[PDB]
């Protein structure tokens, strides 16, 4: 399971368009 | 020995994730938490996946993405800060 955030660890303050 | 030898990548991934970075700054330039966050992810990596060519071909892999695709820069940024902890100082699982 997520032990991390990995990539949402990002998405929680800045992402794009995605 | 360790892998394929005494291979040594340090130099190329740490100027290699820079160019990544300095493009990062370009791009999240209104997000300067990004840049920090990846340098800071690749501090707290085990320096042997770091020093290693497999982080290589993350890296030209990813950071050229990024170049060609800023659209989904961060999802590059995303792998590589996943990158550096899932196979460096956590690598029980490779």
Same mark, same amino acid.
């Given at each position: 399971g997520?032990?991390?955030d990995?990539?949402?660890?990002?998405?929680?303050?800045?992402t794009?368009?995605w | 020995?360790?892998?394929?030898?005494?291979k040594?990548?340090?130099?190329?991934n740490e100027? @290699? #994730?820079?160019?990544?970075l !300095?493009? &990062?700054?370009?791009q999240?330039?209104?997000?300067?938490?990004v840049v920090?966050?990846?340098?800071?992810?690749?501090?707290?990596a085990?320096? @042997? #996946?770091?020093?290693?060519? !497999?982080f &290589?071909?993350?890296?030209?892999?990813?950071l050229?993405?990024?170049?060609?695709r800023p659209?989904?820069?961060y999802?590059?940024?995303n792998? @590589?800060?996943?990158?550096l902890?899932?196979?460096?100082?956590?690598?029980?699982?490779?």
């Amino acid at each position: 399971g997520s032990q991390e955030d990995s990539d949402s660890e990002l998405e929680q303050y800045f992402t794009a368009r995605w | 020995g360790s892998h394929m030898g005494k291979k040594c990548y340090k130099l190329e991934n740490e100027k @290699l #994730f820079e160019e990544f970075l !300095e493009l &990062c700054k370009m791009q999240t330039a209104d997000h300067p938490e990004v840049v920090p966050f990846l340098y800071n992810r690749q501090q707290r990596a085990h320096s @042997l #996946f770091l020093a290693s060519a !497999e982080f &290589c071909n993350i890296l030209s892999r990813v950071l050229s993405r990024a170049r060609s695709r800023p659209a989904k820069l961060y999802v590059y940024i995303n792998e @590589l800060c996943t990158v550096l902890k899932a196979h460096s100082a956590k690598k029980k699982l490779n």
